[PDB]
Design an enzyme around this catalytic site. Structure first.
Site, PDB file in Angstrom:
ATOM      1  N   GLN A 167      -1.102   4.621   4.277  1.00 45.84           N
ATOM      2  CA  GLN A 167      -0.308   4.499   5.355  1.00 45.84           C
ATOM      3  C   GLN A 167      -0.291   5.629   6.490  1.00 45.84           C
ATOM      4  N   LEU A 185       0.945  -1.149  -0.148  1.00 45.73           N
ATOM      5  CA  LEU A 185      -0.030   0.027   0.001  1.00 45.73           C
ATOM      6  C   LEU A 185       0.903   1.218  -0.133  1.00 45.73           C
ATOM      7  N   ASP A 186       0.303   2.316  -0.255  1.00 46.02           N
ATOM      8  CA  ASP A 186       0.894   3.670  -0.661  1.00 46.02           C
ATOM      9  C   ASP A 186       1.160   4.255   0.760  1.00 46.02           C
ATOM     10  N   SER A 187       1.883   5.492   0.687  1.00 48.08           N
ATOM     11  CA  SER A 187       2.099   6.532   1.525  1.00 48.08           C
ATOM     12  C   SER A 187       0.815   7.008   2.134  1.00 48.08           C
ATOM     13  CB  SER A 187       3.119   7.350   1.447  1.00 48.08           C
TER      14      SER A 187
END
Ligand SMILES: CCCCCCCCCCCCCC(=O)SCCNC(=O)CCNC(=O)[C@@H](O)C(C)(C)COP(=O)(O)O
Lengths: 157, 606, 60, 87, 176, 171, 128, 459
Positions: free
Chosen positions: D46, D41-43
């Protein structure tokens, strides 16, 4: 102890040696040292800071002095006794300042003018004065035991 | 009667043992909360008797003894007077504070500083009693500044928390503006009636009375959170919960209007004065009702509501009706003591998080507290007809049947509508929403002290308004003869407020993400008064303290006028007299010119 | 020698002592004088405290 | 107002609110797992997770840290530092 | 204004904007479902031009985003009751007593609590035992003639404690 | 005790309540129990203390002074007349202030006992209060702080000379 | 969509809409790096002279000492009497004094003339 | 009165021929005995003063001030150790005998009959204070402090001598009764204006008035605790005592010539309450507080009402106790940390949990908490000045508000909110400072119960 040359005589001039000495002395950036200038108001040669600085300095940095946002070595803006939180809170306002003062003055002025319009125009439910029994309830006001009877009567209506 | 005076003086003296006890104890009693609670209960049961004797016959009496500094044509003793207000207010305040003793037994279970807390709270009760009883006006001033400084200490209980002592500083400052108003009133009473005592003030009614009336107005608007000097009230809500409950249920909040109630023979006449009364009260009521909308902290909402009810009492003093305002004091006292206590129950039930966002649905999280809050908030505006009906609705209908100011009537109209809509909104957002509060629930009210206290105050706030309002000696002529569509209007405004908050709720169910339209902002952000005043009035006086006062005028100019002129004159004259090099021809030429200038020019032999 | 002999003994010594600046003497003397001036009809607190027979106004 | 926190309990609560999140699986949900390598998953999501921890436990975490948690074990370690989790 | 570097970065600046806008959307929006809808809508609005290879248009859109954010914030952004500005702000600071005290007690109470004070005395001997050499050598050993950072290295050398740890370890427990 | 001549009291008036109820009367039960359980031991203790003080007798005398003549019978500088004169005048000043205190205490007692009908049966006491305070306002008021006796006599002479000029112009 | 937030002497300018934080030159990176270096060295000196177990007294900050000596003792040197200093001195020092002086002259002359007429309410005004 | 003079002499060779660990009990015990001895004085009644000789007498203005002096000496003597106990034995003996000679000339001054004797004993009151503050001034500018001190007080108090000799050889002797019983009014010639100006201006210097208040703050921030308490309490209320006596003469021109001084005092009271809201050096806030209270005193003296003089003497005694106490607490805090600044020493609600009770009690007396004597004084002065003018109450109430705020700021600045946690040297509270606080605040509350003693001659 304390060094004699860690005091501070005289303003900025001349520019090489005195600004170098103030940069070595007050622990600042060289071209960010700002005297006030010398209008002769006293003030020594103490720096100008960005002047609000206390609802600034967001509180998650975890510096040393917990209720002052100090870091033991900042040059400490001249008017700090007016800037401890609990004295003056210069937060960036959610709206403005001019919008604030204009709307507050407008609302209070309008409400006082409507108070004056009320004061010249009363209400009354349509009813005459009360029918006091003995001469507008005489002898039980301020005194006058036998000085003057004040004849005024009521008629049944 | 010896029984009457004896029981009143022992209701005074029962609030004297525990302070000197733990000042003399040094062996820490375990049962100290139980001890303070049972001495307040004994004070209550001794105070119930002579009030019933008072309504039973009358016998309306003053006590006065131990005169000290009977210096000039006046004198002053410790003296207090049993008439009607100081007669039968004291049981209500003792009853409220007794329930707060229960609630603060429970709420402050987890602090070893509990003993000093109860010492401060009982001391605050003593000073509030000595305030409300006295007729010697110096003793009134004693009680005034004492309840001010006990308010200071109890707001600043939690040291640390720079917002708290900031708030307590605001509170004590507006107490001192109450002090300047009160001492101006005392000044006029002394220099024109040879004393400051209630009885001689009532004995001689002066004609020109505008200066002491303005002093009393300033004292009330400083003391009781009124407009211009109001915003110390969420400030006062910064502190702990039972401090806030006692601070703005009966004690310390009615003391501003208590004085104007006490001087009702002086504020009989002077229609300019009663106009100031009711216009100021209408201003307070509309401003705090408009500010009370769009607020999310519970204690700020309850404080804005109590400021609105105090504004109704200022209007009630504006019309010549003081005794309905006292009725409102008693009912309001039961009312919002129970409301603050329910709020603090919810807040300490949910880990002291206190905010309405992140509180949403708490109905059937045990419904003793939800029942308690819906009892309280529907007793707000007076569901017809309960204890809250009598005060508020007879006040507004008697104001409607009065030579009013034609704008204050509409102010009470809009204020009743506003207090309806935020009452219904705070019930909806607090209880019957959808539950939005963080997990690992720790909700518990299976608790004997809390159910006793909430039980006791719902039983109080359901019956005591009718019981007190029934057996008053009739101190005024009731109107009772209203036109049509002027008696219905109370229930009309409260029902339209309920429906209006209901439709705002069912628009809150929708999804649009609307925008601020700046009336939202004027309602939510206190509108502009605490921000503008608390950021402009500190900066101006301290701009003038630094530049003009400290660094400019005193230090540098006073040192350059009185020392420096002398010091430079002496230094220059020294360095021009004694700075002469040592030759002889100079000295003899000086001799010669001195001899010539003494003989012929400025002669000495003629 | 700072509290146990000074403070409580000074408290008793200044709590009561004779009539400082003649207070209760003046109380009872005013009681007797106003009772006399009620019991002999003359008005209480006669104005012009010095006798106008023993006075000499300078003339024009 | 003092419920006792413990390491197993905070581990269970953080893994409960991670498992309740949508676009991960309850199969490959490890304590020692990356928010960059294996969960992929991406920042952005996150920091949505970081927001979930802040909104559950009741305190902000600073952005000097929100760059550099990236795994649930250091999440548990950092709330263990904010709370000082021993009885 | 931060201990690590001289600035945040562009990335964390956009990130703090996203956290603030999402928090203000919490404070604006009750009932949590329309909140979840609007949060995914905001996520899509940032997804529209995430992959700009440009930089100046990205920071200009950042500035215009700050304008539309500050126009659309809330009067009471929902601050948690543990944060500064919030309801607590060191709420139980009444009992946050520093631990340079508790040694200035009469030895009667030091006899009341014996084992705790014996272990505290060996804590202080642990402190003084490794104070001079290792800690002051590691401070005057590693950095440049100017320090130019606010971090500090650990005591990874062999043994004892990382330097300058006493007022970090010995703090109040934040709920006493 | 006191002199009831100088501290007058109105004649007492007390009715008797006649129920006309059947609860009946809790406060009568309470005041009988109060008398029996409070008034008896204090009475016995007061009897004890009265015997213990009346076993031997003391007296305090009301202090009385003579009348040294006047300031008007005193010479130019000659302090030995002026000293007696001014201390005599100052003791008259203190007893005169306490007379004003007694009149004001009568006025407070008349306000409280006559009840909410203010202007009934206090008007004679209000009349004598205005009379005595007209005397005090005319005589001792506007002299200030350093009154000795001489400013009082100056006020006396100036006042009666002004009144003499006023009645000479009125005639 | 927004009037771009006019500032004031009271309303602080927040960190978001500066808009100088988005024109990042290399000079701003250089200044932030050197400012972090200064804060790093000061915290290093303070923490080494803060955690010493033999250190009994206080840490004796020269910043507070320097600010206090600048605030009180370093005013009277240095100074020159300027037009602004002399003008503001004679304004904020003498103006209110002479104003309050004249208004109390006015009030006292009113009260003296009015009680010289005798028509004041001092029928009983004993506590003077 | 010589029954009080001669044991104050014989307490001096006591201190010489006592040894190490032997001077202390002798001085403190015997000075407390003299405190009882002058507690015996209070007999004064009715008609006049009481004459303790052909040379000494006591007005009822002088009795509470004299009892205050002989109360304040042993308190002061215990207060002035731990900052000189490590110095030499001979220098310590010289310090104690200096304080005893100081008290002796204070008794000389308060029990004066003739104004020339009063003047001699006025500057004899001056000369020990100089030597104490200069020898133990404890900071780098005690030089300038003593120099400003002596030159202001002498050069203000210098023409007072000439005016009193002129009154001596125009109106006979200068007994206070023969100053009374013979005083004639003096008209508005300009020589009368300069004579009144000379006397009133010398005591204006000694109060201080507002235009000469920078005499004070250096002389308290750079003084030891004994000389500071002496200076503040006994010297400022001694100057007020002197003006209260000599204002009996020259009443027919004080109305015409008293207008600028009242306005200077009022606007300077406002400015001084403003200037002590923002300063550092916590010791100096009490000094500017003292300037504010003495400005209120001077308003009360130049208006000439008996109400005003009763309020004036009550304000004198209450402010003397408040300022001496609060100086002692500031010395306690300076014994804690070597700062003297305000923002540094913080916290202290946790630590020393009953020192804060004494700070609170002093701060509320300086607030004028209402049963205390300070509110009695301020209240009667406000009553008398409102009868003086219907307008001055703005200044009085604004003084009350700003006084509340700076006194509360003194309370909650240094002793509220957070310890700076780099202090780690402060000891728990000794028995000595707690004993000093107990010696301050028992008589203030005991006079708060029964205050009919301390009111002035116009009781
Ligand atoms: C309240 C009002 C808020 C609305 C804001 C207005 C909308 C403006 C935008 O759409 S954002 C402006 C610039 N946007 C950018 O994405 C700049 C470039 N950023 C990126 O590429 C990032 O998404 C990154 C670097 C992939 C982040 O990676 P993390 O995730 O690994």
């Amino acid at each position: 102890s304390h060094i004699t040359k860690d005091m501070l005589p005289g303003p900025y001039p001349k520019t090489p040696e005195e600004r170098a000495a103030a940069a070595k002395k007050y622990n600042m950036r060289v071209e960010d040292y700002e005297p006030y200038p010398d209008d002769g108001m006293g003030y020594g040669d103490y720096p100008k800071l960005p002047d609000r600085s206390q609802q600034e300095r967001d509180p998650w940095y975890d510096w040393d002095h917990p209720d002052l946002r100090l870091n033991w070595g900042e040059p400490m803006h001249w008017d700090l006794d007016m800037y401890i939180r609990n004295r003056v809170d210069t937060s960036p306002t959610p709206v403005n300042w001019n919008l604030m003062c204009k709307h507050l003055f407008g609302f209070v002025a309008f409400m006082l003018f409507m108070f004056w319009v009320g004061e010249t125009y009363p209400t009354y439910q349509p009813v005459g004065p009360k029918q006091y029994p003995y001469n507008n309830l005489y002898l039980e006001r301020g005194g006058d035991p036998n000085k003057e009877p004040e004849p005024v009567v009521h008629y049944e209506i | 009667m010896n029984l009457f005076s004896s029981l009143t003086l022992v209701t005074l003296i029962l609030l004297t043992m525990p302070i000197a006890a733990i000042n003399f104890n040094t062996h820490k009693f375990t049962n100290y909360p139980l001890y303070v609670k049972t001495t307040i209960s004994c004070a209550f049961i001794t105070s119930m008797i002579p009030t019933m004797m008072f309504i039973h016959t009358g016998q309306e009496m003053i006590i006065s003894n131990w005169h000290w500094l009977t210096i000039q044509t006046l004198k002053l003793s410790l003296s207090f007077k049993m008439d009607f207000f100081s007669m039968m207010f004291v049981p209500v305040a003792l009853f409220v504070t007794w329930s707060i003793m229960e609630f603060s037994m429970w709420y402050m279970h987890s602090d070893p500083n509990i003993n000093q807390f109860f010492k401060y709270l009982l001391l605050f009760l003593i000073t509030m009693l000595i305030l409300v009883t006295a007729n010697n006006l110096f003793q009134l001033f004693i009680g005034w500044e004492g309840v001010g400084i006990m308010s200071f200490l109890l707001i600043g209980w939690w040291y640390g928390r720079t917002d708290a002592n900031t708030a307590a500083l605001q509170a004590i400052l507006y107490n001192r503006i109450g002090d300047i108003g009160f001492i101006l009133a005392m000044a006029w009473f002394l220099i024109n009636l040879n004393t400051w005592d209630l009885q001689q003030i009532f004995m001689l009614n002066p004609n020109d009375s505008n200066l002491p009336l303005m002093g009393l107005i300033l004292a009330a608007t400083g003391k009781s959170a009124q407009f211009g000097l109001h915003p110390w009230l969420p400030s006062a809500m910064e502190g702990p919960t039972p401090v806030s409950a006692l601070l703005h249920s009966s004690t310390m909040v009615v003391a501003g209007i208590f004085l104007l109630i006490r001087f009702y023979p002086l504020t009989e006449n002077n229609k300019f004065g009663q106009s100031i009364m009711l216009c100021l009260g209408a201003m307070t009521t509309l401003f705090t009702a408009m500010c009370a909308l769009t607020q999310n902290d519970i204690k700020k909402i309850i404080a804005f509501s109590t400021s609105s009810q105090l504004g109704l009492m200022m209007v009630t003093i504006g019309i010549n009706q003081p005794h309905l305002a006292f009725l409102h004091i008693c009912t309001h006292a039961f009312f919002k003591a129970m409301l603050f206590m329910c709020s603090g129950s919810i807040i300490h039930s949910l880990n002291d998080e206190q905010d309405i966002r992140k509180m949403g649905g708490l109905f059937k999280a045990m419904p003793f507290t939800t029942t308690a809050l819906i009892i309280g908030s529907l007793a707000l505006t007076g569901m017809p007809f309960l204890t809250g009906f009598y005060s508020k609705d007879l006040i507004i209908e008697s104001a409607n049947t009065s030579y009013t100011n034609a704008w204050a009537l509409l102010m009470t109209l809009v204020a009743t509508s506003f207090t309806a809509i935020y009452s219904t909104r705070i019930i909806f957002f607090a209880l019957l929403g959808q539950p939005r509060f963080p997990t690992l629930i720790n909700i518990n009210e299976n608790n004997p002290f809390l159910i006793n206290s909430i039980k006791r105050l719902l039983i109080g706030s359901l019956f005591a308004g009718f019981i007190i309002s029934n057996n008053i000696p009739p101190m005024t002529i009731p109107q009772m003869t209203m036109p049509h569509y002027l008696k219905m209007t109370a229930l009309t405004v409260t029902i339209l407020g309920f429906i209006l908050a209901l439709e705002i709720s069912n628009t809150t169910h929708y999804l649009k993400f609307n925008y601020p339209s700046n009336t939202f902002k004027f309602s939510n952000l206190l509108g502009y008064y605490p921000t503008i005043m608390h950021r402009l009035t500190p900066y101006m006086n301290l701009t003038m303290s630094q530049k003009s006062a400290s660094s400019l005028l005193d230090l540098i100019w006073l040192e350059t006028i009185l020392p420096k002129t002398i010091s430079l004159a002496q230094m220059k004259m020294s360095t021009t007299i004694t700075s002469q090099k040592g030759l002889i021809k100079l000295y003899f030429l000086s001799f010669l010119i001195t001899i010539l200038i003494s003989t012929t020019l400025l002669n000495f032999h003629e | 020698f700072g509290f146990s002999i000074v403070l409580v003994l000074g408290s008793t010594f200044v709590a009561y002592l004779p009539d400082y600046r003649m207070q209760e003497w003046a109380r009872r003397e005013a009681e007797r004088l106003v009772k006399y001036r009620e019991a002999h009809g003359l008005p209480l607190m006669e104005s012009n405290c010095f006798d106008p027979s023993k006075i000499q106004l300078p003339e024009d | 107002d003092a419920p006792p926190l413990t390491l197993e309990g905070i581990k269970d609560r953080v893994l409960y609110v991670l498992k309740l999140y949508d676009k991960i699986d309850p199969e490959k949900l490890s304590v020692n797992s990356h928010f960059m390598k294996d969960l992929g998953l991406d920042s952005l999501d996150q920091v949505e997770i970081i927001m979930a921890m802040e909104d559950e436990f009741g305190f902000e975490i600073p952005d000097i840290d929100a760059e550099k948690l990236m795994c649930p074990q250091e999440i548990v370690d950092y709330i263990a530092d904010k709370k000082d989790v021993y009885e | 204004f931060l201990p690590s570097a001289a600035y945040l970065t562009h990335q964390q600046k956009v990130l703090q904007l996203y956290k603030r806008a999402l928090r203000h959307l919490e404070s604006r929006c009750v009932h949590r479902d329309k909140y979840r809808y609007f949060a995914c809508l905001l996520r899509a609005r940032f997804d529209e031009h995430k992959n700009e290879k440009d930089m100046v248009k990205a920071t200009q859109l950042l500035r215009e985003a700050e304008k539309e954010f500050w126009h659309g914030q809330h009067p009471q952004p929902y601050i948690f009751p543990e944060s500064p500005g919030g309801t607590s702000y060191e709420r139980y600071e009444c009992y946050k007593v520093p631990e340079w005290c508790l040694d200035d007690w009469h030895p009667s109470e030091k006899a009341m609590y014996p084992d705790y004070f014996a272990k505290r005395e060996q804590w202080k001997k642990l402190r003084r035992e490794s104070w001079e050499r290792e800690v002051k050598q590691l401070q005057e050993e590693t950095p440049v003639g100017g320090p130019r950072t606010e971090a500090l290295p650990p005591a990874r050398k062999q043994g004892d404690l990382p330097p300058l740890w006493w007022h970090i370890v010995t703090r109040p427990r934040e709920r006493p | 005790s006191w002199d009831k001549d100088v501290y007058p009291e109105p004649p007492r008036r007390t009715p008797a309540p006649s129920p006309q109820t059947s609860l009946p009367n809790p406060i009568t039960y309470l005041t009988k129990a109060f008398d029996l359980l409070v008034d008896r031991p204090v009475t016995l203790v007061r009897e004890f203390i009265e015997r213990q003080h009346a076993k031997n007798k003391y007296y305090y005398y009301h202090r009385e002074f003579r009348r040294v003549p006047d300031i008007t019978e005193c010479h130019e500088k000659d302090v030995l007349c002026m000293f007696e004169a001014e201390m005599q005048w100052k003791r008259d000043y203190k007893v005169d202030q306490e007379i004003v205190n007694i009149i004001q205490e009568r006025l407070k007692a008349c306000q409280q006992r006559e009840g909410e009908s203010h202007r009934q049966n206090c008007a004679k006491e209000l009349q004598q209060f205005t009379q005595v305070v007209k005397a005090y306002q005319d005589r001792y008021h506007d002299l200030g702080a350093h009154y000795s006796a001489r400013k009082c006599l100056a006020k006396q002479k100036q006042r009666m000379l002004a009144e003499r000029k006023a009645t000479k112009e009125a005639a | 969509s927004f009037p771009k937030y006019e500032p004031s002497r009271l309303a602080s300018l927040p960190t978001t809409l500066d808009p100088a934080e988005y024109d990042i030159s290399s000079e701003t990176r250089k200044a932030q790096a050197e400012r972090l270096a200064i804060r790093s060295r000061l915290k290093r000196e303070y923490q080494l002279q803060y955690n010493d177990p033999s250190r009994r007294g206080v840490v004796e900050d020269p910043a507070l000492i320097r600010w206090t000596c600048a605030r009180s003792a370093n005013v009277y040197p240095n100074f020159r009497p300027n037009t602004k200093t002399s003008l503001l001195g004679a304004l904020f020092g003498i103006g209110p004094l002479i104003f309050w002086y004249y208004v109390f002259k006015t009030d006292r002359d009113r009260k003296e003339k009015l009680i010289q007429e005798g028509k004041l309410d001092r029928t009983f005004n004993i506590s003077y | 009165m010589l029954k009080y003079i001669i044991p104050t002499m014989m307490l001096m060779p006591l201190t010489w021929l006592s040894k190490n660990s032997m001077i202390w009990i002798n001085t403190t015990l015997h000075s407390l005995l003299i405190s009882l001895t002058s507690l015996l004085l209070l007999n004064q009644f009715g008609d006049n003063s009481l004459n303790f000789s052909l040379t000494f007498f006591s007005d009822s203005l002088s009795t509470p001030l004299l009892i205050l002096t002989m109360w304040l000496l042993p308190l002061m003597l215990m207060a002035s150790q731990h900052h000189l106990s490590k110095e030499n034995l001979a220098r310590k003996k010289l310090f104690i005998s200096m304080l005893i000679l100081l008290q002796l000339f204070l008794i000389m001054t308060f029990t004066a009959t003739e104004l020339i004797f009063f003047y001699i004993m006025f500057e004899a009151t001056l000369v020990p204070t100089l030597i104490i503050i200069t020898r133990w001034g404890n900071q780098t500018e005690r030089l300038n402090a003593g120099l400003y001190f002596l030159f202001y007080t002498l050069a203000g108090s210098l023409p007072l001598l000439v005016a009193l000799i002129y009154i001596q050889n125009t109106m006979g002797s200068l007994n206070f009764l023969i100053l009374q019983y013979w005083v004639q009014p003096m008209p508005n010639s300009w020589s009368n204006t300069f004579m009144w100006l000379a006397c009133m201006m010398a005591f204006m210097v000694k109060m201080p008035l507002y235009g000469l208040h920078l005499w004070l703050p250096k002389a308290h921030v750079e003084a030891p605790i004994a000389g500071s308490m002496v200076l503040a309490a006994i010297l400022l209320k001694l100057g007020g005592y002197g003006m209260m006596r000599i204002t009996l003469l020259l009443n027919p021109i004080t109305d015409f010539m008293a207008y600028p001084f009242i306005m200077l005092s009022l606007w300077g009271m406002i400015m001084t309450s403003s200037i002590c809201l923002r300063q550092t050096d916590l010791k100096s806030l009490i000094a500017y507080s003292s300037v504010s209270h003495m400005a209120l005193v001077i308003v009360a003296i130049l208006i000439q009402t008996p109400w005003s003089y009763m309020g004036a003497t009550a304000l004198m005694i209450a402010h003397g106790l408040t300022s001496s106490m609060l100086f002692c607490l500031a010395n306690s805090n300076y014994e804690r940390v070597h700062s003297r600044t305000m923002i540094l020493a913080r916290g202290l609600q946790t630590l020393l949990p009953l020192m804060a009770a004494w700070w609170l009690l002093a701060s509320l007396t300086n607030l004028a908490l209402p049963p205390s004597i300070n509110l009695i004084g301020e209240l009667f002065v406000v009553m008398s000045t409102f009868s003086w003018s219907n307008i001055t109450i703005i200044l009085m109430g604004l003084n009350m508000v700003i006084t509340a705020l700076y006194s509360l700021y003194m309370l909650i600045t240094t002793q509220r909110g957070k310890h700076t946690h780099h202090i780690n040297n402060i000891l728990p509270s000794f028995t000595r400072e707690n004993a000093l606080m107990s010696l301050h605040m028992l008589p203030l509350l005991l006079l708060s119960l029964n205050p009919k003693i301390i009111l002035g001659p116009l009781y």
